[PDB]
């Protein structure tokens, strides 16, 4: 039930190589997490289409992770969705890298597109020890 701080999450994401991953600076990734889950690793959103969004980046169970419940499941990250609810961000980062890598940009994340794109995303790392 870990809720990250801004700078703590930025450092963790940097350690996992997300800074400038496929051209997306670190602040984009922190901004996305802020507006997807407000940094709560346990965040779960259960949709009416039978899919669920899991964890700090709200990764969806139709294409990305397997929860055994979701119609049309592709499990392209090859993981159980429960791995995305850990206090350790490893599985979420690894699956986020796949999302980007499997054709998508960060437009895959509705909160990134609607609340981060075009903004001064360096503000989300400002003042942090990285």
From Swiss-Prot:
Substrate binds at residue 102. Gene3D superfamilies: 1.10.530.10. It is an enzyme of class 3 (hydrolase). Pfam families: Lys. GO terms for cellular component: cytoplasm; endoplasmic reticulum; extracellular space. One of its GO terms (molecular function) is beta-N-acetylglucosaminidase activity. Disulfide bonds join 7-128, 31-116, 65-81, 77-95. Lysozyme C is capable of both hydrolysis and transglycosylation; it also shows a slight esterase activity. It acts rapidly on both peptide-substituted and unsubstituted peptidoglycan, and slowly on chitin oligosaccharides. This is Lysozyme C.
